[PDB]
Write a protein that binds this DNA or RNA. Structure first.
Length: 571
DNA sequence: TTTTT
């Protein structure tokens, strides 16, 4: 039985002198067992003797300073566990998942101490986890720009802050660990809770593993949410309008849409209706023109010769080679006119609508009859399951080494292959979800402004008649009227601002309407903006260009990493 | 509005 601890480092800001000036660790299953020093060598010695599992919230940060030490202390990265060797799992994108420090072997059992990332399990800021889990959290933050030489003495205040940080993460991790949720990520915790309910044996027969070629083609039909801005509104300031959000978009699809399963069946040319294999993916070649008065829906995989992340109005003289789920193809045919079509090949699948019902009823129930921590975790169980299917085959990531500077550095590693869960289920879930949003936006075409996965934004304050019957504040799969604004401005996908109508309900500010409001909440949404950068934004300064050097970014220096106030610009 | 100091 390996132990588990919540750990955190408080680091220096000096680009020259970067080091741990305070550390802390807390036994997760025993918060009385804890320590808070000020010496990394002190910490690291312990890290080597414990033979347990550690968890730093946002390993990415703390993981740096950890590598720095290992490299300068008889440790070097190694493929497969070796005495005084250390392996790691860092994705090709810079996401840390595990640092496995090996010390040797006792007969067989590897003597090691694995360091994990809590963020991969509780994907939120500590401050947030505190609030949503209702965990005591001290207000304020340790003075970061205070000169701290080596050996500096930690004050009673800074002490409380550090203990508090690791206790918050400990109280959270413990709840999941108290339910089998002992995986590396939330996703895997969901895949776990999901197998418990249907049985691994049933899972194996339902979601068989596919060949590498078969999976490659199925992925050709995979795509994310539907994010799109109507040009008619691009960069213009508009008046009143409203926002609608689907109640649990994915869970909803998983609960009642016809979803694939089983062994696929290849076919040539155009798919032929088959009752036992209702869903399919068609490899098709054609040209197309967006029907007059319809929203674009075709996105050709980024970086080839078609504006990446943009929905095409037409193929523009060039032939398109696409792999589409039948849900995606039915949609394309209603919004576009297709010419010179060629149906090449495809895959049929058996399908049912009862695969996730038990899973979803269970966790929804808990979510409904629970509060604070339990509730959030339940939502986490419910919202992290879909993604696990749309696996990412190639686990090829970075590899560390001491860079010519005394700082941390990386480069590309060998080529490794992980086995696909069941990608066809991923293709249809996201497809079904897009269909949900897109058909609603299209029915509101005359007022549609912006769409983003599970929400549509319309001009006007009155609920559209075509939408009325599927509008409801709580029901799963329904559209909830989330807000109404007095005015707004959209610049680009996920980049806008609104003046929302707020009212008073029992003592707090809540979304209101034109006929009942007392305030106007200014609201900004832009990929990468902060609470600080936001305070400087307003209607007339919000435009393509707006920039400020207020977005700190990881700049690895000798010893670990530092956050330099860099530049942020709306492009 | 990835989340860390």
């Amino acid at each position: 039985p390996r132990k588990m601890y919540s750990c955190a480092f408080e680091t220096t800001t000096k680009v020259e002198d970067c080091r741990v000036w305070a550390y802390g660790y807390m036994n997760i299953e025993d918060h009385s067992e804890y320590k808070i020093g000020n010496s990394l060598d002190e910490f690291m010695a312990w890290v080597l003797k414990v033979q347990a599992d550690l968890y730093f919230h946002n390993l990415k940060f703390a993981g740096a300073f950890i590598i720095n030490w290992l490299e300068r202390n008889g440790f070097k990265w190694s493929a497969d566990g070796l005495p005084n060797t250390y392996n790691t799992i860092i994705s090709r994108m810079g996401q840390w998942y595990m640092i496995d420090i090996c010390l040797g072997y006792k007969g067989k059992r590897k003597i090691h101490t694995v360091i994990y990332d809590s963020l991969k399990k509780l994907p939120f800021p500590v401050k947030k986890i505190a609030k949503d889990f209702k965990l005591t959290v001290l207000k304020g933050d340790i003075d970061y720009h205070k000169e701290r030489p080596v050996g500096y003495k930690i004050t009673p205040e800074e002490y409380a802050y550090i203990k508090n940080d690791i206790q918050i993460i400990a109280e959270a991790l413990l709840i999941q660990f108290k339910q089998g949720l002992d995986r590396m990520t939330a996703g895997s915790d969901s895949l776990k809770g999901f197998k418990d309910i249907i049985t691994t044996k049933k899972f194996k027969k339902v979601f068989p593993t596919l060949s590498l070629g078969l999976d490659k083609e199925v992925r050709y039909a995979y795509r994310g949410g539907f994010t799109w801005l109507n040009d008619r509104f691009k960069e213009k300031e508009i008046g009143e309008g409203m926002v609608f959000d689907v109640n649990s978009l994915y869970p909803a699809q998983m609960y009642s849409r016809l979803l694939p399963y089983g062994e696929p069946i290849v076919f040539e040319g155009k798919y032929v209706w088959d009752e036992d294999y209702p869903l399919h993916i068609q490899h098709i070649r054609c040209e197309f023109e967006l029907k007059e008065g319809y929203i674009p829906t075709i996105q050709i995989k980024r970086s080839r010769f078609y504006k990446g992340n943009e929905y095409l109005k037409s193929s523009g003289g060039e032939i398109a080679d696409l792999w589409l789920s039948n849900v995606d193809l039915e949609l394309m045919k209603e919004h576009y006119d297709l010419y010179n079509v060629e149906y090449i090949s495809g895959l049929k699948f058996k399908a049912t609508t009862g695969l996730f019902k038990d899973f979803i009823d269970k966790w929804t129930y808990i979510k409904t009859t629970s509060e604070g921590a339990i509730k959030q975790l339940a939502k986490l169980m419910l919202n992290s399951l879909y993604g696990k299917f749309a696996s990412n085959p190639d686990v090829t990531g970075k590899v560390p080494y001491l860079k010519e500077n005394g700082a941390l550095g990386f480069r590309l590693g060998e080529e490794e292959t992980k086995d696909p869960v069941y990608t066809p289920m991923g293709v249809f879930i996201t497809a079904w979800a897009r269909y949900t949003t897109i058909t609603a936006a299209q029915a509101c075409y005359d007022r549609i402004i912006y769409c983003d996965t599970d929400s549509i934004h319309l001009t006007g304050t009155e609920i559209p008649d075509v939408i009325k019957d599927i509008v409801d504040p709580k029901k799963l799969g329904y559209w909830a009227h989330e807000s109404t604004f007095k005015r707004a401005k959209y610049l680009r996908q996920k980049t806008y601002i609104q003046d929302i109508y707020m009212k008073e309900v029992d003592g707090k500010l809540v979304e209101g309407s034109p006929d009942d409001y007392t305030d106007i909440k200014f609201s900004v949404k832009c990929a990468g903006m902060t609470d600080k950068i936001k305070k400087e934004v307003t209607f007339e300064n919000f435009k393509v260009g707006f920039s400020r050097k207020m977005k700190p970014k990881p700049v690895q220096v000798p010893g670990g990493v530092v956050l330099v106030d860099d530049t942020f610009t709306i492009k």
